[PDB]
Structures are given as structure tokens and as C-alpha cells.
DNA sequence: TTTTTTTTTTTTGAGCGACTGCACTACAACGTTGTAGTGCAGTCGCTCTTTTTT
């Protein structure tokens, strides 16, 4: 790639210490092995490292050996650098494929985790069908989220890949109740786990909102979910020390682990979460399949959803029939069993259907740019609107449609209203940038779009003050003692007490808080996409820059498309969009040949 | 090139020198038994200054 040229002074160091006196070509490996672990890339295959390289020729004549070095196994072996697996070295070439040591070992033991652990506990399936049909009231035709609950209370370790929309909460509530009732006489302590903080408390009130549902006893609803964890404060991560409180010797005492929003877990965060749970721990992962990757290196909800296409086995088809009740399908072919009877795939959406422009851009984003192409043309579905954005007076137009997204949160906040319709106009309509600086970024769009409330008269705005009347911001770090998250919005007005910050609390009141008491704030009228990830926005309006970036691609567009609910619109190039959806962010990874065998 | 969060302390004096208890033999009083000196081991006090120059 470009960003894969420019080597980073890490890689180059890392080079230099780790070849040292050794032939360039170790150094050259190295350095590269280095650059694609930097950029999120597991495995290196040795085919690219051989063919993509103008310097193969050059240090095939650097080597000097007997059956001269010919290949590159053999001058990688002959360092003391790489090894096969035995030697505590740094490389591990095993499989034609180089990694590092700790990604090796965490790659391996997400393998031995998902191939070897993963049994199945054998209940009663004749209680369990009067649970499902006692719970899912519809028993008409096939029904996935009841054979995802079954699926779910049926294994050990299971995972539910389902889009937004599409009632997973529901699902979960449905599980967990049927698994309360299934096991009455023994303790069930459920616990659940969230990657961020925001998306905990979004699982919080939507588990007790669905939870309070269902009809219970006094010792079932005992038996609830009280809240729902980070994975750094459940496993008991320090700031200090990278020491956890479970992580080898004491596994967490839990009977069933729910951990939400798998989409967002690295590969080490996983490697940590393995470790902790003991041998009869039933762990239910959330997560969408085609959302963005994870934040640092790796990709394990997609390496891991990646065979749900598959389908079930011959022989747990008929278990699932036998369950739910219904015909249930069978896959064909035998590859892996146990990951593939883990998996399951949700494609009923509750919140829209085919007559919304959502769903279908959602379902032709993964498919080729034509059919997205023809998803926006035919008619528009009066949800998805495309505006070209070329020059300046597209980008006045821009601003124009911004201020007719931003109408009524601005008449709102001229009529001195309340301010929790102020927050619930604001939350209606968002903007979302793909960078950071620039004309086309965070920043950027905060400076130009406050410009244009500074020339048009809407809103007063102090040049000296900072703290003018309607300005929203963000907080970029956790705060427990204040009540607020990371990726929380809050709007500065006067009640008549002075300038102060209302929150929206996911409890449905709202919190006034001082201006000084906030430790991070940051104006927020254009969010990025990966920190809008677990909220919900009315009317989302993309906004895509005009230079080539690595970060607009297929994954970044389905998570700006599943942002919006019912409008979405649209300020990019043609050859940009189209070029997003068929360069899709890759990472290679070990997992496609250790699942395999 | 995008981004995620985290609250738990822990430890630290030992060598020098005496006091007393237990054992063990050497030697004289009455082969055996009482008196005396020495050595080994557990337990306990103690103790590690002072200061000002452009």
C-alpha cells in the first residue's frame, strides 16, 4: 500500500536490532513483518515476501552457504532470528506464514479455544421446546432468533451475528429467560461484558427494559443481570501494571458470560478473556459479522463469523429441528462441526424491512458498487439522498442542508425551550466525517460550520468566551464519578443559573453539569465513524473527503449506512464510493488455516 | 489512518556480647557418688554524635 512504504522508525529499529549482523534479508523480513503488524496484519505469507520484493534477487546474492540459501525457509532458519516453534526466538515461521511470538501464541490459543474447548452440554430438549414455544409466540414458519437461542443454550461457547435492527437484545432476553427456566434448582450468575463503556450502558438499559418484559417469580427475577462490565474492569486491568487480577490462576466465578459487541475485541483482548474463564463457563458473544474491524491488530469476530455461511451440520439440523420444532436446514459439506454448529446467522430485521432504503443499501454494500449504484438510483426510497461535493459552492450547499438538518434543534434552542427537547431535536440529525484535520475531518467541519452560525444569524457566538449558548460537545474519556461515558453528547445553555452542560442520561433524565467539572469536551456537529459506533442518529449524513484514504472502504461505509434509521444523505465522489466497496480491509491471519484441520 | 480504558498493597537490622539452662567429664569423698570446670544452645540488651566554608 502507500502507508505501507513509508516505514514507520519502529519497524527500522526493530530491523536493525533484531537482524543486526545477519544477512539484509532478515533485516528485510523483519522490517516488514514489523509494518504489517503495525497496520493490523496477523500472519505475513511468505509467497508476497518473495514476490512483491525488488530486493529478492539482491540478497539471494547476498547469501553465501553451501546449498547457497535458496530458499527462504532455509535463510530464515539458518539465523538464530526464526525458529520452527521450539526456541524462544522472536519470529515463528510455521506454517509458510511469519508472525511474532505473542501473536502466534495468542493466535493459537484462540484456535485451541474455539476447536478443542468448545463441547456440547446435553439438556433436555422436551423442556427446552416448551420454554421456546412459551417465549416466541410465533411458530408459523422458521423463526432465527429461536434457533439462536437454542443454538445458544444448546453449546458451551456460541456466537450470534446479527445487524442492527434486527432484535438481538430481544433474542438475549428470550435466552437468558429460557435458560432461568430451564435450570431452576441450580444458580445461574450471570454476568455481561461491553468493550466500551457506552455500549455497557446501552446494553444496561436495554436489557432492563426488555428483562421487565417477561413475567418472572421472585427468585427469577432475583436471578437478573444487575449491569454489565468492561472487559479492562472485569478482568481487572490496571493502569499501572498490565497485571490482571484472573488471569491465569483464578478464573472468574460466572456461570453464563454474555459478552456484547464482539466487533470491537482484538485478538489480545480476546487472549486475555480465554485465559481468564474457567472449564464450565458458556460464553455467548454479540456482534454484527460485516461491521468495522477491531481497533488494534486483529480480527476475531470476523475470522470467527467468517464460516457461518457454511451453515449447520447433517447432524444438527436435526438436533435444531428436534428443538425448535419447525424445519430447520441443513449445510452441506463437513469442514469444522463444532465452529460451525456454533455460529448463527440473523437475517430478519424487525426495525426495517425491504420497503426501506436501509436495509437493501446495507445488503448491496457487501455486494458489488453496481448494485449500491442502482440501490440509491431507482426511485431513492425516499431514505437515501446523494449529493455531489466537488468544489465550493457544493460545500455551501453542504452547509445548507446541514442548517435545514440542524432547523429544528436551532428553532428549539432560539424559543428557550426545555432542554431535553434540545438534546432529543439534536440527537435526530449527526454528521459523519471520515478524518480528523483538514478541510475534511472533526475540526474542520466544528471551525466551518460554527463559521456559518457566526455569519448567519442563528447563533450568537463570543470570539473570547468559548462557552457561547448552544454549542455541543463530547467527552473523549471515561468519567465514572461523573455518570458520563466516552461518546456521550451534552448541549451548553442557560437555565438562568449561569452556562451550564445538560446531559442526557440513558436512564431518561438529564444531568446539569458545570463546565469546569467536565475533564475532556470537544465540539461534536460532525462525529467520526468509529467513535459514533453503538450510538443511533435519526438523520445521518455522510461525509466523505475527495483525497484516496485507507480508511474509506466497505466496512466504514455499512457502518455509516447502518448508523442512520430512517435518512440517510450522502456528500462524496462516485469514484470514491465505488472505489470503497471493492477494496475491503483484509487482514491476514492464521485463523483460516487452523480452523481448516 | 481510524481508535480502547485501568484502580490493588506488599517490605524493611543483625552482629557483638552477656545470662542462663543442659550436658559431660575430672577428680575427690564415701566401685560408687558429690563437687567443679567447661562447652553448646536458646534468649535477651544494644546500637549506629557534633557543622560551615563564595
New binding site residues.
Given amino acids: 500500500?502507500?502507508?505501507?512504504k513509508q516505514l514507520?522508525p519502529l519497524d527500522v529499529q526493530f530491523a536493525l536490532t533484531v537482524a543486526g549482523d545477519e544477512h539484509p534479508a532478515v533485516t528485510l523480513a523483519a522490517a516488514l513483518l514489523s509494518h504489517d503488524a503495525?497496520?493490523?496484519h496477523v500472519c505475513l505469507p511468505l509467497s508476497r515476501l518473495e514476490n512483491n520484493e525488488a530486493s529478492h534477487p539482491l540478497l539471494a546474492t547476498c547469501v553465501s552457504e553451501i546449498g547457497e540459501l535458496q530458499n527462504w525457509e532455509e535463510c530464515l532458519l539458518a539465523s538464530q532470528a526464526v525458529s520452527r516453534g521450539d526456541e524462544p526466538t522472536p519470529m515463528i515461521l510455521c506454517g509458510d506464514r511469519l508472525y511474532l511470538n505473542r501473536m502466534w501464541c495468542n493466535e493459537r490459543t484462540v484456535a485451541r479455544f474455539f476447536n478443542e474447548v468448545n463441547h456440547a452440554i446435553e439438556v433436555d430438549e422436551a423442556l427446552l421446546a416448551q420454554t421456546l414455544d412459551k417465549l416466541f409466540p410465533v411458530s408459523d414458519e422458521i423463526n432465527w432468533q429461536k434457533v439462536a437461542a437454542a443454538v445458544a443454550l444448546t453449546r458451551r461457547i456460541s456466537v450470534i451475528s446479527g445487524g442492527p435492527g434486527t432484535g438481538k437484545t430481544t433474542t438475549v432476553a428470550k435466552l437468558l429467560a429460557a435458560l432461568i427456566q430451564m435450570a431452576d434448582g441450580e444458580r445461574c450468575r450471570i454476568r455481561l461484558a461491553a468493550?466500551?463503556?457506552?455500549?455497557a450502558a446501552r446494553l444496561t438499559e436495554s436489557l432492563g427494559k426488555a428483562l421487565r418484559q417477561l413475567p418472572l417469580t421472585d427468585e427469577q427475577k432475583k436471578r437478573i443481570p444487575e449491569d454489565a462490565?468492561?472487559?479492562?474492569?472485569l478482568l481487572?486491568?490496571?493502569?499501572?501494571?498490565q497485571?490482571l487480577?484472573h488471569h491465569a490462576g483464578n478464573p472468574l466465578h460466572l456461570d453464563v458470560l454474555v459478552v456484547d459487541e464482539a466487533s470491537?475485541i482484538?485478538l489480545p483482548?480476546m487472549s486475555r478473556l480465554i485465559d481468564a474463564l474457567p472449564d464450565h463457563a458458556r460464553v455467548i458473544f454479540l456482534g454484527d459479522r460485516d461491521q468495522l474491524?477491531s481497533?488494534?491488530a486483529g480480527a476475531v469476530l470476523g475470522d470467527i463469523c467468517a464460516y457461518a455461511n457454511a451453515g449447520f451440520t447433517a447432524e444438527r439440523a436435526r438436533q435444531l429441528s428436534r428443538l425448535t420444532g419447525t424445519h430447520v436446514p441443513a449445510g452441506t459439506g463437513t469442514e469444522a462441526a463444532s465452529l460451525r454448529d456454533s455460529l448463527c446467522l440473523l437475517q430478519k430485521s424487525y426495525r426495517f424491512g425491504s420497503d426501506s432504503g436501509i436495509g437493501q443499501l446495507a445488503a448491496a454494500i457487501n455486494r458489488g458498487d453496481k448494485t449500491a449504484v442502482k440501490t440509491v438510483f431507482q426511485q431513492d426510497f425516499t431514505d437515501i439522498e446523494k449529493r455531489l461535493l466537488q468544489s465550493g459552492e457544493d460545500y455551501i450547499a453542504m452547509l445548507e442542508e446541514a442548517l435545514a438538518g440542524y432547523g429544528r434543534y436551532l428553532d428549539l434552542l432560539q424559543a428557550r425551550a426545555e432542554p431535553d427537547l434540545i438534546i432529543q431535536a439534536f440527537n435526530e440529525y449527526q454528521l459523519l466525517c471520515?478524518?480528523?484535520?483538514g478541510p475534511f475531518?472533526?475540526a474542520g467541519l466544528n471551525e466551518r460550520i460554527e463559521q456559518f452560525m457566526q455569519q448567519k444569524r442563528k447563533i450568537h457566538r463570543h470570539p473570547h468566551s468559548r462557552w457561547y449558548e448552544g454549542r455541543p460537545v463530547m467527552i473523549?474519556?471515561?468519567d465514572?464519578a461523573l455518570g458520563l461515558?466516552?461518546?456521550d453528547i451534552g448541549i451548553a445553555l442557560d437555565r438562568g443559573q449561569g452556562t451550564r452542560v445538560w446531559f442526557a442520561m440513558p436512564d431518561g433524565n438529564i444531568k446539569s453539569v458545570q463546565p469546569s467539572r467536565l475533564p475532556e469536551h470537544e465540539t461534536t456537529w460532525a462525529?467520526?465513524?468509529?467513535?459514533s459506533?453503538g450510538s443511533e442518529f435519526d438523520h445521518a449524513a455522510l461525509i466523505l473527503p475527495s483525497?484516496?484514504?485507507?480508511?474509506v472502504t466497505r466496512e466504514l461505509v455499512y457502518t455509516a449506512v447502518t448508523r442512520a434509521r430512517r435518512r440517510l444523505s450522502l456528500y462524496a465522489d462516485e469514484r470514491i464510493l465505488s472505489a470503497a466497496i471493492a477494496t475491503r480491509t483484509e487482514r491476514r491471519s492464521g485463523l483460516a488455516a487452523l480452523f481448516s484441520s
Fill in positions: 500500500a502507500v502507508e505501507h514507520r503495525g497496520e493490523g468493550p466500551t463503556g457506552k455500549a462490565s468492561t472487559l479492562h474492569r481487572g486491568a490496571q493502569p499501572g501494571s497485571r487480577r470491537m482484538d483482548m474491524a481497533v488494534e471520515a478524518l480528523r484535520e475531518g472533526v473523549a474519556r471515561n465514572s461515558f466516552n461518546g462525529m467520526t465513524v468509529h467513535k459506533q483525497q484516496r484514504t485507507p480508511v
